[PDB]
Design a protein around this ligand. Structure first.
Ligand SMILES: OC[C@H]1O[C@@H](O)[C@@H](O)[C@@H](O)[C@@H]1O
Ligand SMILES: OC[C@H]1O[C@@H](O)[C@@H](O)[C@@H](O)[C@@H]1O
Ligand SMILES: OC[C@H]1O[C@@H](O)[C@@H](O)[C@@H](O)[C@@H]1O
Length: 391
């Protein structure tokens, strides 16, 4: 540790408590339950917006984790609110598992079952169980895990999209030329993430075996050996549809794999994964860190230098994690500089706001929502919570 690292933690903790937590508390929907689904760039909440399950589970995870780390009783109450809406509106009582989306009143809008949604459900429900002791949350988390393992898993990963009654179908995620990606890194990344949290709290042998299995999948099939990059969108056999690098996915995967590795009982695999995580962090720092912040992606030979909120959040955690493992100050410097970038260019200066979705390559704000089905408190909230836990 150091004076810089201590001040870094204190700055992030203050930011979480004074900016992020009160903002998401203001999205609480006390008329219909859950949290409002949309807030535009002008800070206007669309109270009637459809409510995405992933967003609700991310809010459940966030408030639960805030309670677990900060012991804020208000956060526990906010988590309960998200949990009630999950169990009452997103949980399918007839066929089990979580709907994709509901209306602002909770009427099912999209009842298909996606592994991406189920994974975030496990992640949020397991965190909420730690916060509350609610064995209903535990039961739903275990049931989601059982369904993924017994209905969705295949020899080379998970089939990602199902009908409401769990009959498989083609995926809903597309390449930028419109070809269905039957295997996606971000679906499988969040399975890994949720299984790590579930095993951390339960330590059951079935969960451990599934955690080792998905870690092995990342090492053997998803990682592009020798490149520091993971495949993004693939066919059913983990062949890339396009040569795409997502620097944000890479650096997130780096520290999530390193975290899962701490539970591995296979020493060989553990050493492989810890080595992989570091190789990714090093290549991310070399290729994607511009001295201020991380760029977004490269699709074939076209580089997107936009600064995206979640990319920068995961960069802070991934570089700090690499610093903890290597003690090489270059990673610590990159992590703090990225935070200083976030503070100056992505934290919204307006009252009653939070983080901007992105700024462009010239650091200009782009009209994008502050809250949306894909913009959550989870990436940036977790950035603060991780540093608090690790320092
Ligand atoms: O503070 C909110 C206001 O901030 C400004 O930048 C504009 O986008 C306004 O339309 C918006 O209402
Ligand atoms: O799925 C629920 C939605 O279904 C639509 O067809 C409309 O009736 C909406 O008012 C409703 O919110
Ligand atoms: O559209 C999915 C996107 O949603 C965002 O919130 C992030 O989690 C990204 O990692 C992801 O690519």
């Amino acid at each position: 540790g150091s004076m810089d690292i201590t001040r870094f933690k204190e700055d992030l903790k203050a930011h979480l408590e004074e900016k992020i937590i009160p903002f998401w508390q203001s999205l609480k929907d006390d008329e219909f339950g859950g949290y409002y689904g949309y807030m535009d760039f002008n800070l206007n909440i669309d109270r009637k917006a459809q409510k995405g399950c992933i967003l609700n589970s991310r809010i459940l995870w966030f408030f639960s984790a805030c309670y677990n780390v900060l012991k804020s009783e208000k956060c526990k109450e906010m988590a309960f609110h998200a949990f009630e809406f999950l169990k009452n509106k997103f949980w399918d009582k007839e066929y089990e598992g979580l709907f994709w989306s509901v209306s602002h009143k909770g009427v099912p809008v999209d009842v298909t079952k996606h592994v991406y949604v189920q994974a975030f459900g496990i992640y949020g429900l397991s965190e909420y169980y730690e916060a509350s002791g609610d064995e209903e949350a535990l039961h739903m988390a275990k049931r989601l895990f059982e369904i993924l393992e017994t209905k969705c898993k295949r020899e080379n990963g998970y089939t990602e999209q199902f009908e409401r009654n769990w009959q498989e179908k083609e995926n809903r995620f597309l390449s930028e030329n419109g070809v269905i990606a039957s295997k996606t890194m971000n679906t499988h990344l969040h399975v890994l993430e949720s299984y790590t949290n579930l095993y951390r709290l339960l330590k059951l042998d079935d969960v451990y075996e599934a955690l080792e299995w998905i870690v092995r999948l990342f090492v053997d099939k998803i990682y592009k050996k020798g490149t520091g990059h993971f495949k993004v969108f693939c066919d059913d056999n983990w062949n890339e549809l396009i040569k795409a690098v997502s620097y944000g996915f890479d650096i997130e995967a780096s520290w999530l794999l390193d975290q899962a590795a701490k539970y591995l009982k296979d020493e060989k695999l553990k050493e492989e994964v810890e080595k992989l995580a570091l190789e990714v962090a090093q290549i991310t720092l070399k290729e994607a860190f511009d001295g201020q912040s991380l760029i977004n992606e490269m699709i074939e030979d076209r580089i997107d230098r936009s600064k995206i909120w979640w990319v920068e959040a995961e960069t802070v955690v991934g570089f700090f994690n690499a610093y903890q493992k290597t003690k090489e100050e270059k990673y610590l410097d990159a992590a703090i500089k990225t935070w200083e970038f976030i503070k100056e260019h992505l934290v919204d200066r307006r009252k009653n706001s939070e983080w901007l979705w992105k700024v462009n390559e010239d650091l200009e704000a782009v009209n994008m929502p502050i809250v949306e089905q894909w913009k959550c408190p989870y990436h940036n909230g977790r950035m603060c919570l991780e540093i608090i836990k690790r320092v």
